[PDB]
Design a protein around this ligand. Structure first.
Ligand code: HL9
Ligand code: HL9
Ligand code: HL9
Ligand code: HL9
Lengths: 121, 121, 121, 121
């Protein structure tokens, strides 16, 4: 399965995840960047029976940036895939939406890309 | 608060969601487009304590496109926000990642936008 | 060809464009939103020999948000297609990048979607 | 200022650009991936008076994937910024829109990211 573990992206954020037999992803996310501190709940989904032709395993997950310590009124989803093997890796693109008035909605979404590996920064 | 229930986007897809007290989103997604049939599990997160300044409620969710009937080796995340009121809507952008070889990774992610309302278009 | 004309998006921004025989787009953009005033130079490209099977005409263009009156140190590209016929329309997605330090680069790009029609708001 | 010249991204594609005094980007793009062969015209814009606070220079450009050899009925825009220095780079995100019927419009746009450097990877 390969996905369960502790991953780090290029910003030094820490992605602690468990890939369940039902296709669920469950864990915590700690962002090294932004209006965020300590750990946040995450939940997502992954293809629990991927192709065997060398394709990666599609997955995605969501963090809402509220925990017991602060609330940044925003949420990020990551969409990507797990690529196993030599140096396993989760390649993602992400969308970060901030709570906004409908008038400011046009400016409410950031886009980016994160690459995760199991190598502690 | 007004999130739980059945929503429809401009493609006629059906988003059935429950917003739990812990910030969790759970439900089913039925896509009227693409390599999809019947319902798929979704899970996500939402800001359970949004701003009281008229801002929307930030949220997101993931569908992996595998159910008991078929497996499209892909996953979509929607990132967006709930805006309550007379014409309640959930405005989203989404990323759909397909399982891909490293060679084809550059072409592995689609982007789009879905507007969900309480009434079918 | 259909693209040459004055278009307006859902924000009330005004897109004045000329589609040239070489595949070039040339014109001005006036944004009804953001750190912008009056007109900005735009340049882009379009498929000058599109499919005849009912597909739209792929195109894109760029505005850097500097003119004689102000400079917002940012640029937007729109990628989309012209759909001719009953009510002609240009459907786009866009990416707005703000000048940033490499440390703040993660937060430097907004994503959105604009739909243009020739109907004055 | 340091923008003009030849750049390469992680796919081995070759970006040849001239930054003119009027904010214009002009050049050629040779893609090492996808339905592309040989050079394609590009045109774009860049901030010709960027911030003096260490921020990058915002920019963007478009390629329509038609040249004298072939027509892929599609176009890519790259939105990003030039960051000068010892390891100069142009960091971009991109949107690739394909010509599509209204029916298939939802699936008509790919998203990705390209990092351009002065040295081939
Ligand atoms: O910073 C966060 C939450 C932390 C996000 C961390 C991001 S997730 C993708 C990337 N990968 C990581 O590992 N980390 C980063 N939320 C802000 C966004 C900007 N905000 C506003 C408010 C008002 N106007 C404009 C902007 C306020 C809330
Ligand atoms: O169609 C789906 C899953 C259903 C997606 C429905 C999408 S979710 C965002 C939007 N909002 C909706 O309500 N519905 C649509 N997955 C395909 C994608 C394209 N695929 C390939 C494979 C190989 N090469 C190229 C493309 C194979 C798998
Ligand atoms: O607002 C503009 C330029 C006008 C953009 C208009 C946008 S183009 C897509 C959409 N379609 C339209 O028709 N109109 C809008 N640029 C800002 C962005 C936010 N900026 C910062 C600075 C520092 N930190 C965070 C954010 C400063 C520069
Ligand atoms: O491949 C290209 C044009 C070359 C794109 C190269 C891309 S630009 C961003 C990235 N950075 C690079 O340096 N190179 C790549 N266009 C295809 C796209 C997929 N197409 C369809 C058609 C019908 N159904 C589904 C898909 C047909 C046309």
């Amino acid at each position: 399965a390969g996905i369960t573990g502790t991953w780090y992206n290029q910003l030094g954020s820490t992605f602690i995840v468990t890939a369940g037999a039902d296709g669920a992803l469950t864990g915590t996310y700690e962002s090294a960047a932004g209006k965020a501190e300590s750990r946040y709940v995450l939940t997502g989904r992954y293809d629990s029976a991927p192709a065997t032709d060398g394709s990666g395993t599609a997955l995605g997950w969501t963090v809402a940036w509220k925990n017991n310590y602060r609330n940044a009124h925003s949420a990020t989803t990551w969409s990507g895939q797990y690529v196993g093997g030599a140096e396993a890796r989760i390649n993602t693109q992400w969308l970060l939406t901030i709570g906004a008035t409908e008038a400011n909605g046009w400016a409410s979404t950031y886009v980016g890309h994160d690459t995760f590996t199991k190598v502690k920064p």
